[PDB]
Design an enzyme around this catalytic site. Structure first.
Site, PDB file in Angstrom:
ATOM      1  N   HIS A  51      -4.395   5.184   5.060  1.00 43.93           N
ATOM      2  CA  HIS A  51      -4.116   6.475   4.437  1.00 43.93           C
ATOM      3  C   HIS A  51      -4.747   6.540   3.036  1.00 43.93           C
ATOM      4  O   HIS A  51      -5.283   7.570   2.633  1.00 43.93           O
ATOM      5  CB  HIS A  51      -2.599   6.692   4.374  1.00 43.93           C
ATOM      6  N   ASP A  52      -4.686   5.438   2.297  1.00 41.25           N
ATOM      7  CA  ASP A  52      -5.285   5.393   0.968  1.00 41.25           C
ATOM      8  C   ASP A  52      -6.773   5.646   1.085  1.00 41.25           C
ATOM      9  O   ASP A  52      -7.314   6.511   0.399  1.00 41.25           O
ATOM     10  CB  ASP A  52      -5.088   4.020   0.321  1.00 41.25           C
ATOM     11  N   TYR A  77       0.747  -1.252   0.000  1.00 49.24           N
ATOM     12  CA  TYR A  77       0.000   0.000   0.000  1.00 49.24           C
ATOM     13  C   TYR A  77       0.780   1.308   0.000  1.00 49.24           C
ATOM     14  O   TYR A  77       0.280   2.311  -0.493  1.00 49.24           O
ATOM     15  CB  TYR A  77      -0.994  -0.011   1.165  1.00 49.24           C
ATOM     16  N   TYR A 135      -2.546  22.563   3.218  1.00 50.58           N
ATOM     17  CA  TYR A 135      -3.194  22.752   4.506  1.00 50.58           C
ATOM     18  C   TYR A 135      -2.251  23.379   5.508  1.00 50.58           C
ATOM     19  O   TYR A 135      -1.066  23.567   5.237  1.00 50.58           O
ATOM     20  CB  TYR A 135      -3.721  21.427   5.045  1.00 50.58           C
ATOM     21  N   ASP A 171      -3.041  12.776   6.680  1.00 58.06           N
ATOM     22  CA  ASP A 171      -1.593  12.752   6.769  1.00 58.06           C
ATOM     23  C   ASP A 171      -1.102  12.687   8.213  1.00 58.06           C
ATOM     24  O   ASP A 171      -0.185  11.929   8.528  1.00 58.06           O
ATOM     25  CB  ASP A 171      -1.010  13.983   6.067  1.00 58.06           C
ATOM     26  N   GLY A 229       2.682   3.543  -1.655  1.00 54.38           N
ATOM     27  CA  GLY A 229       3.168   3.749  -3.007  1.00 54.38           C
ATOM     28  C   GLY A 229       1.989   3.626  -3.945  1.00 54.38           C
ATOM     29  O   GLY A 229       0.976   3.074  -3.559  1.00 54.38           O
ATOM     30  N   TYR A 237      -7.713   9.144   1.816  1.00 55.64           N
ATOM     31  CA  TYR A 237      -7.629   9.970   0.611  1.00 55.64           C
ATOM     32  C   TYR A 237      -8.841   9.766  -0.302  1.00 55.64           C
ATOM     33  O   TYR A 237      -9.321  10.707  -0.940  1.00 55.64           O
ATOM     34  CB  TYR A 237      -6.343   9.652  -0.162  1.00 55.64           C
ATOM     35  N   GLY A 260      -1.237   3.277  -5.973  1.00 59.92           N
ATOM     36  CA  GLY A 260      -2.277   2.275  -5.821  1.00 59.92           C
ATOM     37  C   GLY A 260      -2.112   1.429  -4.573  1.00 59.92           C
ATOM     38  O   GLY A 260      -1.344   1.761  -3.680  1.00 59.92           O
TER      39      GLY A 260
HETATM   40 CA   LIG Z   1      -1.310   3.604  -2.085  1.00 57.42          CA
END
Ligand SMILES: [Ca+2]
Length: 124
Positions: free
Chosen positions: A48-49, A28, A73, A99, A30, A52, A32
């Protein structure tokens, strides 16, 4: 903005590894992501993906797809702790928290060298 995300990482885990060590890790961290997270750190990236993906759906971000990547931000770093300032608008604030949580998650996770730059099309 991704550049700020990089600085947050430098905030919670100072003088350990460069930004690139968390940019190409597991299934995960990096471009995709798929399969099962190889370990706890990889797990941080999976969340985190999703975060987003949620930002892109968030009405406050006006459906601007690249928002979580380039939206600037306002955050603060002190005592290896990251906080998202109140002067952030709804969209920026959500992205900042994505983040913030990730940076702290990385710092609380062991780093396994054998999971760095692995062949995703085999282990994922
Ligand atoms: Ca990713």
């Amino acid at each position: 903005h991704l550049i700020q995300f990089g600085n947050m990482i430098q905030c919670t885990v100072p003088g350990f590894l460069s930004w690139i060590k968390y940019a190409d890790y597991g299934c995960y961290c990096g471009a995709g992501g798929s399969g099962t997270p190889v370990d706890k750190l990889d797990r941080c990236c999976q969340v985190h993906d999703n975060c987003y993906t949620q930002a892109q759906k968030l009405p406050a971000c006006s459906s601007i797809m690249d928002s979580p990547y380039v939206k600037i931000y306002s955050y603060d770093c002190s005592e290896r702790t990251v906080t998202c300032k109140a002067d952030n608008d709804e969209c920026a604030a959500f992205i900042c928290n994505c983040d913030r949580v990730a940076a702290h998650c990385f710092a609380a996770s062991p780093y396994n060298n054998n999971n760095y730059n692995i062949d995703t099309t085999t282990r994922c």
